Amino acid sequence: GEVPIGDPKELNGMEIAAVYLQPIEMEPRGIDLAASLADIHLEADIHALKNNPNGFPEGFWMPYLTIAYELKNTDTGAIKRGTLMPMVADDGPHYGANIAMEKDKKGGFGVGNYELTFYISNPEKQGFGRHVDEETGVGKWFEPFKVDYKFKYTGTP
Amino acid sequence: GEVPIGDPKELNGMEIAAVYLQPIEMEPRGIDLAASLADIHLEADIHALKNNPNGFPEGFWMPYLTIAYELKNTDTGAIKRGTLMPMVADDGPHYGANIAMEKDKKGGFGVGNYELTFYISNPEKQGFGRHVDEETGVGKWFEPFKVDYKFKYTGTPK
Ligand SMILES: [Cu+2]
Ligand SMILES: [Cu+2]
């Protein structure tokens, strides 16, 4: 039961898609917003394309990324920011966050039209290395980038 | 190319293999022992088995693991320890380190008989999360564990 967000993008060797579903319970506790405080779980699905230039096998999950988001209700003008955290669910690893929409104390994050932006930086920021020898080496990582989606939020699932 | 260390182990929903190669030039610089100062590149290859209890599809690389190693020359008694760091090569991600063997004059790390031990802790130690709700959740992570290999080190591959 995942709601697609906008259209997926292909860039920097990766497919980058967004979905939301109902709030989830994550361990370790005290990091992700508690399920009962949230209205959605937002996920970024990020996997390697064919011929990924940093050596990741097609379809592999892209690990050690730093991902921030911005969510804007274009009807009300309300904007929030946060980060997506790496975690695993029954359908495998992803980057996600529980997010208050209707339940956000500030208001303005209810049913309506939204723009979602991911701000993504490469794994080296988190100490992940790459071979650069002639035999087994791989190319440079992408510079930090953003991807943008548009979607209708129809209410908490 | 790659020299296999011992046999791969299937444990805790993962296949856990060890290999060594020639020393590898890594980026970013300083993230590991310089290739020129090393004799081997030690790698741990760790992927999900079928029916992985923590949600990982078969074949996927297991990320965010903490992998400490101990390498012991059982002939000489020489021991060294370190950690294998996550990185990617043209055939995919793994955990690795450049290691001085003959070049290490602080111990007897020459050609001979070795025991290699990996001490492996689960992704939660590095902040990686898991769903635990009924609908989308996965099983509990393994407690820290060790795997042991024996091999003959014959010098840098060439
Ligand atoms: Cu999640
Ligand atoms: Cu390596």
Side-chain angles (χ1 to χ4, degrees):
Chain A
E2 293 164 13
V3 179
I5 291 165
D7 305 326
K9 294 98 177 60
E10 300 182 3
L11 46 79
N12 307 145
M14 303 180 282
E15 170 190 83
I16 311 183
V19 303
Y20 72 88
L21 53 77
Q22 74 277 359
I24 307 307
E25 299 174 35
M26 196 192 79
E27 289 190 8
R29 309 274 178 182
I31 310 295
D32 190 43
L33 183 66
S36 68
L37 297 176
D39 292 293
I40 66 179
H41 195 63
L42 176 60
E43 299 184 353
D45 276 333
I46 312 181
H47 301 84
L49 305 173
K50 293 172 168 66
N51 282 307
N52 175 281
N54 304 111
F56 277 83
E58 186 195 7
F60 266 28
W61 183 56
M62 298 301 298
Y64 296 90
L65 299 179
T66 302
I67 312 179
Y69 75 84
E70 187 175 353
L71 186 61
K72 176 225 283 45
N73 178 319
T74 54
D75 303 326
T76 72
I79 297 161
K80 67 167 68 187
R81 296 167 188 87
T83 57
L84 299 183
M85 295 286 77
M87 66 187 81
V88 69
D90 65 340
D91 63 354
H94 61 262
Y95 297 93
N98 278 352
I99 301 182
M101 298 290 291
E102 293 91 328
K103 298 191 69 145
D104 191 308
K105 275 159 41 160
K106 290 199 184 56
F109 296 102
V111 172
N113 300 294
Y114 284 79
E115 295 173 354
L116 169 71
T117 307
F118 295 146
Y119 298 93
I120 302 175
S121 304
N122 73 50
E124 296 189 8
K125 184 172 190 275
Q126 300 184 16
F128 187 91
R130 68 188 173 91
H131 288 207
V132 298
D133 63 298
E134 197 156 314
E135 181 174 348
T136 70
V138 306
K140 286 184 169 184
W141 284 105
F142 58 88
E143 294 281 289
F145 69 102
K146 63 184 190 175
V147 287
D148 292 291
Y149 307 85
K150 295 173 67 163
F151 75 110
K152 184 160 197 56
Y153 175 56
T154 48
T156 177
Chain B
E2 291 192 3
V3 185
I5 297 168
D7 295 305
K9 310 300 193 297
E10 289 192 12
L11 303 161
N12 290 317
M14 303 181 282
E15 179 177 356
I16 308 157
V19 305
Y20 74 93
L21 314 70
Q22 69 274 20
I24 297 289
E25 206 66 60
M26 305 295 312
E27 291 276 334
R29 291 152 159 241
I31 207 176
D32 202 37
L33 186 67
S36 69
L37 293 161
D39 292 292
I40 68 180
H41 187 73
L42 179 62
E43 298 194 353
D45 285 330
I46 307 185
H47 299 81
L49 303 169
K50 196 182 169 54
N51 304 307
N52 176 270
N54 305 118
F56 280 80
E58 182 179 6
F60 265 25
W61 183 61
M62 303 297 301
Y64 300 94
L65 297 172
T66 305
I67 305 177
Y69 69 88
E70 185 181 295
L71 190 58
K72 167 177 160 63
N73 181 322
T74 57
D75 304 323
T76 69
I79 294 162
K80 61 161 68 189
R81 295 176 176 104
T83 59
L84 302 184
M85 59 159 294
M87 64 182 79
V88 69
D90 66 349
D91 65 333
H94 61 265
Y95 299 92
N98 286 337
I99 295 177
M101 301 291 282
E102 293 98 322
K103 295 178 184 167
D104 188 352
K105 304 289 173 221
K106 305 182 305 304
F109 295 105
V111 166
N113 296 295
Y114 284 78
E115 296 178 355
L116 173 68
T117 307
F118 291 154
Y119 306 86
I120 304 176
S121 301
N122 73 46
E124 213 194 341
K125 189 165 182 166
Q126 289 177 30
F128 187 89
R130 75 176 181 109
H131 298 206
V132 306
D133 51 287
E134 163 169 20
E135 187 62 44
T136 76
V138 303
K140 209 180 162 39
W141 286 113
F142 57 87
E143 293 300 331
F145 73 103
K146 310 187 301 293
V147 296
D148 311 290
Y149 309 87
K150 296 197 183 76
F151 72 108
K152 196 173 180 191
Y153 168 63
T154 56
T156 303
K158 53 168 68 173

